[PDB]
Amino acid sequence: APRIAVVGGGLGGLALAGMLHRQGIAATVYERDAGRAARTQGGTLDLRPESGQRALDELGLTEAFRGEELRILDPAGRTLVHRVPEIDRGALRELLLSKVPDEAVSWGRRLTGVEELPDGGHRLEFADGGHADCDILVGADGARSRVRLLLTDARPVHLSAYLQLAITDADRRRPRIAEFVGPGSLMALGDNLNLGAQRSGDGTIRVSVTTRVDADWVDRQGFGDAEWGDVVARLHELFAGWDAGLTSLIDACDPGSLVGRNIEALPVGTRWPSRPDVTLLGDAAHLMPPVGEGANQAMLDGVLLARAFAQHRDDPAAAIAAYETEMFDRAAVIGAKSARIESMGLAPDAAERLASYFNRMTAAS
Ligand SMILES: Cc1cc2nc3c(=O)[nH]c(=O)nc-3n(C[C@H](O)[C@H](O)[C@H](O)COP(=O)(O)OP(=O)(O)OC[C@H]3O[C@@H](n4cnc5c(N)ncnc54)[C@H](O)[C@@H]3O)c2cc1C
Ligand SMILES: [Cl-]
Numbered sequence: 224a225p226r227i228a229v230v231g232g233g234l235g236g237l238a239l240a241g242m243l244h245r246q247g248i249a250a251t252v253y254e255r256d257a258g259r260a261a262r263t264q265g266g267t268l269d270l271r272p273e274s275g276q277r278a279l280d281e282l283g284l285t286e287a288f289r290g291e292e293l294r295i296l297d298p299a300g301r302t303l304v305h306r307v308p309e310i311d312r313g314a315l316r317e318l319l320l321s322k323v324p325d326e327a328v329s330w331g332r333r334l335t336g337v338e339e340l341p342d343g344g345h346r347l348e349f350a351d352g353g354h355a356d357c358d359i360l361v362g363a364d365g366a367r368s369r370v371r372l373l374l375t376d377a378r379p380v381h382l383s384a385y386l387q388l389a390i391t392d393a394d395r396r397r398p399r400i401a402e403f404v405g406p407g408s409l410m411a412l413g414d415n416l417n418l419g420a421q422r423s424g425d426g427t428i429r430v431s432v433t434t435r436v437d438a439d440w441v442d443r444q445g446f447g448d449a450e451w452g453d454v455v456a457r458l459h460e461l462f463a464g465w466d467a468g469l470t471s472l473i474d475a476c477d478p479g480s481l482v483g484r485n486i487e488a489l490p491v492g493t494r495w496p497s498r499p500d501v502t503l504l505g506d507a508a509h510l511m512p513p514v515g516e517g518a519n520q521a522m523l524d525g526v527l528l529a530r531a532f533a534q535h536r537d538d539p540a541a542a543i544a545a546y547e548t549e550m551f552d553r554a555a556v557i558g559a560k561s562a563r564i565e566s567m568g569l570a571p572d573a574a575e576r577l578a579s580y581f582n583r584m585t586a587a588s
Contacts, residue, residue, distance in 0.1 A: 225359050227248070227251070230253050230363060231368075232252045232256070233365055233521070235505030236364075237316070242322075244324060246530075248529070252323065253349070254329065255333035258330055259316075259330070265312065266311075266312055266429065267310060267311055267424065268310055268311075270518075270522075271308065274519035278525065295411075298413045303412075332353075334348070334349060335369070337373060343500055344359070358539075362502070363503075363504050368503065368507030370501070370507060373501050377493045379488060381486075381487050382487055384440050385485070387430070387484075389428070389477045390427060392426050393422070400475050401422075404428055411465075412573035413574070415571055416434045418462065418470075419432075434569075438487075446483060451478040455474060488562070489511075493558075504550075505525070514565055523553075
């Protein structure tokens with residue numbers, strides 16, 4: 224009856240804990256957040272049949288779980304290509320929490336250190352000064368995982384800056400733009416600089432800026448201290464030369480609503496020697512850019528690892544090793560494909576590359 228500790232009550236950590244519980248296996252989730260909705264989580268996720276949806280199915284949440292047009296543009300506004308499972312992130316977290324016993328999540332416990340024990344297992348050190356011991360440790364603590372360092376010294380590599388703005392109540396307040404975006408999404412591809420817009424089912428349009436810059440670029444802009452007029456002017460300067468129709472999205476956005484982050488990823492094919500009493504899942508195991516659909520993979524990781532523990536109830540080393548063999552292979556395949564997509568879609572000549580792809584395919588007609 225090993226004491227299993229799961230650091231991180233995110234998508235993967237909760238999926239693991241819920242699936243272990245459904246197999247009769249107790250585990251404790253240690254989560255830095257003060258409560259179940261301490262951190263706002265806006266937007267929607269598309270869950271895939273083989274991953275996100277499979278997890279909800281195995282968790283017993285299939286019932287509970289229940290136009291996506293896409294336009295790709297160039298900076299002049301020309302449509303390069305045209306194409307014609309959704310769940311709110313907050314609602315998904317509620318669904319996952321409903322399958323984890325309430326008393327098995329320790330809120331407000333932020334892992335700051337791990338000390339290996341001679342007899343096996345680990346001592347978990349927390350910011351509040353307390354500790355907890357376990358026999359099995361699962362790192363489910365996200366992109367900046369603290370547990371990851373027990374398995375590998377591999378670090379996330381910086382890829383890009385990502386800025387997120389909003390248009391609230393677009394149908395009433397910005398009807399032209401609402402009609403221009405429509406019910407799906409659009410992405411305009413420039414020179415190491417992309418502009419995206421995605422309509423949500425709550426009446427809002429999310430506007431994004433992605434640009435190939437160094438890790439300190441977001442901080443250097445000082446958006447959080449700037450007057451909104453200056454933020455808009457700087458963004459127009461960033462998009463100099465673009466079609467004024469496209470860049471009017473900037474002026475339509477809710478004043479004061481800009482969140483900036485860095486997009487990063489562990490190197491493709493990252494893996495490690497399997498250890499007998501500790502492992503990783505989700506972003507901790509294999510952080511990828513958003514195109515890697517890491518929410519889906521973290522949920523899949525969680526239920527596959529639980530199945531492995533239940534398949535080897537007398538040997539957690541065998542469970543961890545079986546889980547990792549499959550997880551290493553899946554992460555390598557998806558990581559390589561995500562890296563091709565991320566580097567082709569954000570490039571000095573991104574629009575040209577996309578057009579060339581279809582021009583080439585015509586020759587095979
Ligand atoms: C901009 C953006 C868009 C994305 N879009 C999509 C999409 O459309 N589809 C998709 O499938 N994926 C998407 N992803 C990826 C997805 O958000 C992540 O891959 C996913 O959340 C990984 O889940 P996780 O459980 O591994 O980590 P997380 O969900 O980040 O959970 C980690 C948890 O650990 C906690 N924690 C962290 N450190 C500690 C500590 N020291 N002690 C205790 N607790 C700690 C955190 O508070 C958190 O609760 C997107 C990601 C980004 C950045
Ligand atoms: Cl309008």
